[PDB]
Symmetry: C2
Subunit: 183 residues, 2 copies
Amino acid sequence: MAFPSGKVEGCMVQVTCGTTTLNGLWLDDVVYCPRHVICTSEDMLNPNYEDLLIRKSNHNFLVQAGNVQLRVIGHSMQNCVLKLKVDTANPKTPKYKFVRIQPGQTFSVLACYNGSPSGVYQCAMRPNFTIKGSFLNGSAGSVGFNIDYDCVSFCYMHHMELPTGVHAGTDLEGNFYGPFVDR
Amino acid sequence: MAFPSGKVEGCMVQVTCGTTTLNGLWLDDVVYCPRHVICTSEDMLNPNYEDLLIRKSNHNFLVQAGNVQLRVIGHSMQNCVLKLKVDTANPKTPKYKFVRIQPGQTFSVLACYNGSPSGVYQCAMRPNFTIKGSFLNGSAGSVGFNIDYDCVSFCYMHHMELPTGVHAGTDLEGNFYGPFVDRQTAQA
């Protein structure tokens, strides 16, 4: 059984940089999202994420929570996740922790397409640190979580599909699960 | 494969009558719940629901939405569901409709205990109008639903576990799916 998704639904936003838009997680005054939102159609072969994040402005980021626009007042990169500081804290932030899970352990995924929640799925990571599921197609930035009492433990952020059809992502500190690199 | 449950989680309340507690659905200023909340463990064998309800008053019902108490100002029985009118309207009431589904159609169930959402899962009504699910004691009043754009179609309310370990419920108008009854004696 998947966990109820209401507490996570209230944290999902849309993050746009140029012609890349994907899902982000809005907790307190920070928006977390995959760092490869700063790449374009050519910056995926070999990117210099250090150069790129310096080369971008706060106004180069479009953060929308439904029809509310959020102004980025600063950006940094924690491993493989971009952390966007915004001018207002999420009033719907639940109690949360960031945890790292192991293959075999199940968690719920709230699949989102363009910031809008589509479905809730229970999955588990395979021993190769991948998740099998066509439900994650196009849903980069969707998260995985468990709930204990009143507290949401975020454990996963979807990043990209592999040529093999499987999916790969990080924990909420930007550390990938398994041997993968966003390139 | 389950629908996001946030719209329904904001409608789930805890309903208590005497020593019996189960779940209710709070839409506008009405709470819908299984009528067997007015039964004790002993009453469920062969209860006279009309007689039991006539001896109940509004203050015999305790309704709580999170930590806010909703005072009951009226009650009526519609088939197998009880409709409790409360003194405030749910500000999170979504756009909604009540629908009756058919076997083979899928829907999401939000399993709740004591008014608190516990999990969500997709299921389908089997051809004998039962459902195979993971409900424990206290799950009665959990609801099943589909989402159409922004409209929530409520189609199921859980009522009882059958001797075979499958589950029986009604629609939101209080009519059982199939020939089952909310009592233990003389079940279909």
